[PDB]
Amino acid sequence: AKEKDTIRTEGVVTEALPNATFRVKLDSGPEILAYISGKMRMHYIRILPGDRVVVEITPYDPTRGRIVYRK
Amino acid sequence: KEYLTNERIRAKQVRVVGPDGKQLGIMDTREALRLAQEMDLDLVLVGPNADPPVARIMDYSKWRYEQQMAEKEARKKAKRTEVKSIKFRVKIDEHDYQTKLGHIKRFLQEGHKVKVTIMFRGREVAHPELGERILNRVTEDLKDLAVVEMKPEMLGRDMNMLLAPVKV
Ligand SMILES: [Mg+2]
Fold this sequence. Notes:
This is part of a larger assembly, with chains A and B. By secondary structure, chain A is mainly β. Chain A has one helix spanning 38-42; strands at residues 7-17, 21-26, 33-36, 52-57, 64-69. Chain B starts with 12 loop residues before the first strand and ends with a strand. Chain A: It is found in: Cytoplasm. Chain A: Keywords: Cytoplasm, Initiation factor, Protein biosynthesis, RNA-binding, rRNA-binding.
């Protein structure tokens, strides 16, 4: 069915967390657990703490996301 | 340093000096040799290249020993504390950082020059800033026992500093 509420806000990478997970300070507001998207994993993409990246946010937990956009 | 004795000496007329500094004159070699033999000492070529070659009467082995002493003693009581270098990464975390800082402190205490280096590999954008933030912080932490001599500086894939001890 897909809940269309998959929020597409941007963010500055803040921290290298373990296992492809990243504190990413959003341009909208707070920092959230933001794991790497599967697509990104497939195409390598070493994310570094200090990049502009777009996060896919749940409205149920807006403190947890998934980077969709490399750089 | 590094001289020849008695019979190895190839010149004829040597300027002959006693052990005290007594100028016997410019003498033919054989006579000098004889004198040396008489003295219980040896004739030593201390200036081979000069006008009449400079020959001094001394106990040569003893002199050599003395030289070795004065050398090794003085040299290695004046021997430098070199450079101690420390490597980092940009993404660095707490415990490790603290350990590194401690190491640096130790080095400073000892008296050793500190090269503080961060390796990078690629995407040199957030690279310099974070490097500064780390290295500068480290320096600040050591601002009691250490002083910056070299500022935050690029090297290609690398960022370096040089810290000197506060009192050496
Ligand atoms: Mg969703």
